Amino acid sequence: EKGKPLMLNPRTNKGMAFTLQERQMLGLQGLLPPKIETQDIQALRFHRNLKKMTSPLEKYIYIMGIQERNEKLFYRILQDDIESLMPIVYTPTVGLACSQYGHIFRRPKGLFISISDRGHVRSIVDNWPENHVKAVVVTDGERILGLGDLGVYGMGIPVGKLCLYTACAGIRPDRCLPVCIDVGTDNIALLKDPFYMGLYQKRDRTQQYDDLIDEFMKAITDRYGRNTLIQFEDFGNHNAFRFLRKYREKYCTFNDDIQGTAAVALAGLLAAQKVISKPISEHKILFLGAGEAALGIANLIVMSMVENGLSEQEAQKKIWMFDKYGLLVKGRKAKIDSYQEPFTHSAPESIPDTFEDAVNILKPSTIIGVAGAGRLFTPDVIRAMASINERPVIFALSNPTAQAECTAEEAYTLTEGRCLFASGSPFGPVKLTDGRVFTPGQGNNVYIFPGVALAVILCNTRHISDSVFLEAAKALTSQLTDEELAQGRLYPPLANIQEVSINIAIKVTEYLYANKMAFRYPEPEDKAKYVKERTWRSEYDSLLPDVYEWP
């Protein structure tokens, strides 16, 4: 397409970076100021304006707005300092954006499929402009981070996730599709909000819901292909597992909250063990919460131990869980589903009432917070872990920051710098009164899904086994340098997320081929070069037509 439309499409718009020749040949002459700018000048304009802003939400509106104006510049900007912008485009600010989605709305992003569209989903999928989608991130908005049911306001999550697909792993933006499934919401506040972007009805929990998701999976793969990567994000607990189980063998799909989180957590644990070097037999892990993340992390931890000697049965016995009804013990009054059974032990001597009791009675060496319900890791809980363990492992992975089990300051201070801490949301360095400085790592699935998605896409993988995430876990931790470990970091610096994601992708691609799970042919000889050659770049491409003379 030529003319104004080239400027209206954020995918092709270069702003004043369009060269003189491009302008004349594409009919843009006169529609742009005379000045020919470079991407560097455009980036500078951005940083100057960003520096003058105050609130994170304001910055989020500004930068995400660039994605709808100049895609290339949008990614160039993220690439310039991914670390300082992560908190704005991702957790915790993204949580704030979703809560306010209907208030800040300007332009829609992604595909919206509602229960009222049942029987016509394919027609909706055919309306999406892009023809070669390779990655889809879908949500129904029932479990947005630890914020709860946000309905269609949850679309901000898939959009954010996909920006990271590109920013971190170089996956082509035009081949990503954010999707929001709208079947209603139980959030009473939103049902009375005049700005709400979804259907004004309670969540439809009948078979019609399952039917809609089925129709969706089918319509997506019918248009784009059976190996289209489909990432399930922020679905309620019940639906998450059953959809994963029902589809992981029929489509190329995975759940970021169960599997991606499982892998980053494991990566962090493997790094801690590298410092503590505790006898595999003396491992005792207590989970605060027993849902998507807990069960995901537990299963991956068991796989790591089994491949290290222990049997599945003896590894599962070293893992305990404590949910909103209390410790998961056999015969407890509160439900116990099939996924939890393997981690449901026989009631101890005395049944703990609070999590603090659980810590003093079970005496775990590791504590992992994934309840998404706030400061459950109280000062007493942390003090107990420091008195029981010389180097207690404390993970507070719930997002956003307000839902975190505890802060980095609390963890380091209350344990006198002896803990190995990690959190889902960002926290700056902590300096103790004695002068020691601790730099906490972020155990967030952003370190995993980008690299894994790229490998799966590049290898034309049909299904994703759980052993893939185990490998990604190992690839992530294998990049941690001893110097970073010394600082208190259990994960590679966020500043190097680009490189780290590519290395994870390279390792996973090698794994996929070696295990006959890759169908891209021919098999590349040098997997590293294969991956690096296919990463999308934020540098502008020439849009000039191929002119040359005939000899």
Next chain:
Amino acid sequence: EKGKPLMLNPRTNKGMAFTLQERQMLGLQGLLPPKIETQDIQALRFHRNLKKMTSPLEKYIYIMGIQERNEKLFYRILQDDIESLMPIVYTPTVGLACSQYGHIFRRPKGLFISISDRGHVRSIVDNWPENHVKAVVVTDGERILGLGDLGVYGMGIPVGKLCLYTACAGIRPDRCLPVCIDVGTDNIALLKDPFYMGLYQKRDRTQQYDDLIDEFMKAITDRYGRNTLIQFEDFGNHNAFRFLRKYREKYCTFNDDIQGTAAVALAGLLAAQKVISKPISEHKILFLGAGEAALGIANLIVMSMVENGLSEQEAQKKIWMFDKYGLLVKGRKAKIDSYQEPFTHSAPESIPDTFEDAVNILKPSTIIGVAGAGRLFTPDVIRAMASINERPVIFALSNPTAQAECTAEEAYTLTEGRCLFASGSPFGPVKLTDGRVFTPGQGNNVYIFPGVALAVILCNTRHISDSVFLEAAKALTSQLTDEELAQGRLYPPLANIQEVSINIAIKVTEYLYANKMAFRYPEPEDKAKYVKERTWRSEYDSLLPDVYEWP
């Protein structure tokens, strides 16, 4: 167009206001959130966000950005409260925007024609998307308000002017074209600004400049028609008059700074006379400045006096001017051009050194500030006017606020509430120590160009005579209510600018037809209905294809 393109184009995009049937039939289903909104809900979202914002520049960036996303919504929002938004979209904030245009740039607006494009201007004009342009506002940015030479940064002015064409007179947005002629700039600061949007060279003042302007006039009329309305805006003093004289009889053109400002000022004078009722013989007008506005206002005042008895020669003697070199007297050292001659009189007994001296010597009954150089109407100047006159008329028309001759508070306090004040920039009501509250009117050409432009366009007028502006002036003043005069207002309240513009347009069309200057046929019986039936509205139109059953 159908599909995503309908949403990428601000002219057609309705956001969530696209109806269910429109989405399904136009291929938008799924590309928008499930919610169907009304323009009312969208307007509420805007006002909510606007209230949380602090600076006027931030509000400018936000509202102008809306014009690039949803055109209909943009004008609806202006229409909701034009009085509160005028200061942000127009003077004084627009002046601030221009000075920083390159720093806040996101998307271009309007056509840019540079000297480097001489000989190819027609191909640039053909690149503009719209096919039926009826109104053009062009500037070379040499005299932006009272800010001086801002080069291409001056494009903010034509853009702002055209917003008012639509907001005030309902002139179709798609038939408006803002233009910026870039031939360099003498502003040293901009020539070293890495964000400058124009050519990095000094202003070209050779015949090539005249050639370029001529090429533009020809290219514009060749594509859109000889009766295309061309409004010259913010050109330097020398070029402004010569281009008006050269083209006014060749094309349908006028200069807002000479003629538009002349009509608004005259409107104010006719209102003041309604309260002062001074004998035409004792009218003594003293101008601070003798350029575009002064000459424009003087000539229009003379036309008013002549049509009221006095002869052209005796009306001109009642007008004195004081420029940067001093009082304009025969044989002075400073130049006196042909336009100034009629108002250059024989040196008085003592030649004033300052403007205050000129007031005491000439004892003018009216003082009009149009020098664009700051607070020249000093406290001493104002006191003098109050000592000489019982009801002194004081006009500080220069823009923006910082370049105004004096504030409303100074005028009213220093004359103990006896002056009839008017300014180019907005000033809130003034409350004297004694309790009296005065509400000053804004003598800005925004009260004139929208209505005049609409009438000229609707009547297919070929050329615009000065008498058209005299009639617009009378039309404006004839709308002032006695109650408004009482408050101290010399102009209808800005909040009613829409109705005021339409009434001016109806009067002007009646004038155009009665004087055989209108060529639109057939001549309408009821001019009022003719104009109101053709005004563009900000209400969403149906985009549904015409579907109906056949017999």
Next chain:
Amino acid sequence: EKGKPLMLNPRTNKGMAFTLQERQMLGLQGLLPPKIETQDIQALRFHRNLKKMTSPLEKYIYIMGIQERNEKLFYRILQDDIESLMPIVYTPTVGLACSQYGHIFRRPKGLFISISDRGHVRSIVDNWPENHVKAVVVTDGERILGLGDLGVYGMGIPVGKLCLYTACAGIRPDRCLPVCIDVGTDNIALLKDPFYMGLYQKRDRTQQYDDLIDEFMKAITDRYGRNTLIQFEDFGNHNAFRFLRKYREKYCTFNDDIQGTAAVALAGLLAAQKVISKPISEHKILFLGAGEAALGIANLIVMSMVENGLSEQEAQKKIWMFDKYGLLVKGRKAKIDSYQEPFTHSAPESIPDTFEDAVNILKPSTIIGVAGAGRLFTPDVIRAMASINERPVIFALSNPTAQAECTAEEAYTLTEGRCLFASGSPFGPVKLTDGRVFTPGQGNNVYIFPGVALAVILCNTRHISDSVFLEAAKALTSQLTDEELAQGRLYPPLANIQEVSINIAIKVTEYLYANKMAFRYPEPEDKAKYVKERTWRSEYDSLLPDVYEWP
């Protein structure tokens, strides 16, 4: 897209078959006559006009012109009577159209890549409008049928071949790409023809030619996929083999003149054996010609004999060849390439001078004409075959008709109805003076490539082995009914080519999966249903957008 463009694109244009609702919703109301037609009425209009036409070339221009106006109607028309239209859209008339291509030109079809575009082939491929190509038929025009070098005029062949892909096997038209490689021509007549559509230069036979084909293969696969089916058609003898050998293992490609013809010839021979039941040991095959078809058929015949007992060495001894320089015997003066070695035997007692002498000396039971040089199977050659064999097998495969080795009338008449005859071009039934009626079969590769291509495409096959063509040969012959053999038919009736192609495809698809040559996952349970469900149909599809109310 909507509006006039839907009517200008033959892929979407339905003419008066657009329903009333489609017209109103797609903006076509008023652009078509009021009448709403059905495809049946349109087909009728065609047959009524075709009946009035006289020459075959005129009929070719008319129907092939329909392909560029209404694609759906074009295929419906072919499907109505494939047998009567085959001689017009295919051999022999397609040969006439090519030789007159530049004289009857109206619209281009296909992609043209010239040697002058070397280094820019990819940019040419990117210009093709369709984004999901699965089948490409390419030629360089050096060996068009038996007509010789026709340069770019040869594009009519790939266009014809692809029409049959759709008419016979239901391959989607929009996924087919006709390609003509232009590197010059040695045809002196065309080099002086002002209407010639190619480069006016002799054929480039340097490495640059090979480089261009390489660039083309890489570019096509880079954009459409490594498994894109590339069918080489009508390349000269030298290049045909070496391109086959060079690419068959790197891309999904095959040569129709070497392998396609080989398979249909074999099918006919297997059918003849069904009625003659000759002892495998007494088989003696003599070839008139020793090129693409001869070596192709010979290699397949040998594979058939080897899988039926005989050794490769013993089977090759039963095959003799006679080219333009005479019988192929060891140590002859004329060259003998690597492909001919296996069939070049020790000179017999006396070296035959003519083909007739070769028949009397070798006493072959089968005679196969593939020299593309005219009536070389003279009456004397035919009588000799009838005197040496009770049931002589005579195949005159060269096309078009004028180039055939002999006619059906001559074969049946001169052998007193004792021969089993087949030809590449159509011949009507022959009635002998005694009253017996013989219906000759067409041994043309059109019976093979459509079905094979469909199976290869549906199975996502990467490379095509020779054994695939053997299986196609068997699948074709296995459809011959005893009643048809009785009439003299060695091939299923041409009228049933659609069902015959589908059946061959089903057989080949089963063959590819059983042998691990199919990569389409998952493997279908019922191959028959799998193939039939994916065949393109000529019935109009509804173009209405999905409209439905929200509950």
